[PDB]
Amino acid sequence: NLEQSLLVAILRQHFVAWEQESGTGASQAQIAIDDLLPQLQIYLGDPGSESKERTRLLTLLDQLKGHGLVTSPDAHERIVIRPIIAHLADPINLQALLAWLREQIAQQT
Amino acid sequence: DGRIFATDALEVAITFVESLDNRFMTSTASRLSTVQREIENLETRLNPNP
Amino acid sequence: MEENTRQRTENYISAKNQHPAWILLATRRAPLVLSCLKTLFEKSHDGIPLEEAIQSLSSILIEHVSQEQYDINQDNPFLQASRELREWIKRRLIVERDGRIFATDALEVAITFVESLDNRFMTSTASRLSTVQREIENLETRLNPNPANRVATLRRRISELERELQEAEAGHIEVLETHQAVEHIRDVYNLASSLRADFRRVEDSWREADRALRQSIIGEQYHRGDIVERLLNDQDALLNTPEGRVFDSFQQQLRQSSELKAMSERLRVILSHPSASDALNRLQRHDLRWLVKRLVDESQTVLQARARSERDVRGFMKTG
């Protein structure tokens, strides 16, 4: 789902950063929950209630766990981005997604 | 953080209704004296002449 | 009493249904009305001659020709202004007296709200935290009558001021940096401009007292029984405690013409500093420059109004 794909893109960006800084061997491609809420605030809007946006973010992360791209939050409100993401969003698929999205925008015009 | 707050939009709105009828008078002797002291303090601080 | 909160809810309902300020802000045309009224009353010093008001309002309506969505007609702005002034006088947010129009308390409150919506001057500032510090320091010295405390406060403040003088003699003086000067000028303008706020309300209070007195006189089938209590004293019959006495005390300070003489020079000296170019826009500079004269003129008008009402009610307890 599109809104899930947005979060997938954000997670993939963090994944490439972490992988390029650590090397591919390390297994802890982690991110803190609080770091994603500002990211989503730009796109999905601000509901003025930390609880509502946290619930939204956790629902999205759960729906992605259903796909296997992320684990559930641990005790420190941190998630591990499963490496499968690198294969889900790779250049061959990102190019197709961009092509689809540009057509959607053109239709919106 | 689990606690509600009143945004500025609500603060202004409340300040409006509460200023309709029974607001404290500002056109008072005390305020007119206060402006004297404040003007004097500002004057003593703006000019550089020792 | 906790039922005072429910009574307050009732008060809010009554204000919503009866107060001109809240009535105006709820209408669909409120933005246009408020903009026009502010543009009309912004430059003025004391009221507006009615004919002068019509021309300015017509010119403003012409400025709003492109705003045809509010029925701003091009055929005759003079007639439109004449209609609008009576429309607003009927809403008793502007009043007609002595051949000039004024802004009543409701319009003042509405404009203060609208222009405090977004770009209001900051009140949470270091300058005001120094101002309240000074004022609260001063009040205590006058609230307690103990002589030892008073002499101790005076003889410690003397030492503080003496040390500061000794430091200034050595040349350690320092002036405000640009941003502090800007902030202080803004705070002082915010303070000074608030003196003019309540003139339009003292008159309403005095008129209310006059109407109450006349209602009490007429409501007793035998006036002589109560007229004795009123005419036994030569002092003003408009004994309005809530606001009249506060305004009288404020006058008791205004008439000290020496302070006004000093202020007239000090304000223009302050406005001469280069930083005043940025802290206050042109309109605010104008208002702060003439504030000293404006307060005195407004006070004279208000005093004349009280004199008229008192004289014409004294001409009524008699012959009754």
Next chain:
Amino acid sequence: FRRVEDSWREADRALRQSIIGEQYHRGDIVERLLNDQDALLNTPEGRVFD
């Protein structure tokens, strides 16, 4: 107090939108990071509050 927060949050959103928009510029971000000052320099409110 309730308006300084809104101003800072608005500055934050503007900064993030600018970062996203500049798809091909690293100079601005490296300039921001090397600076010792806080990234959210909302002059009209932040400095007065400080």
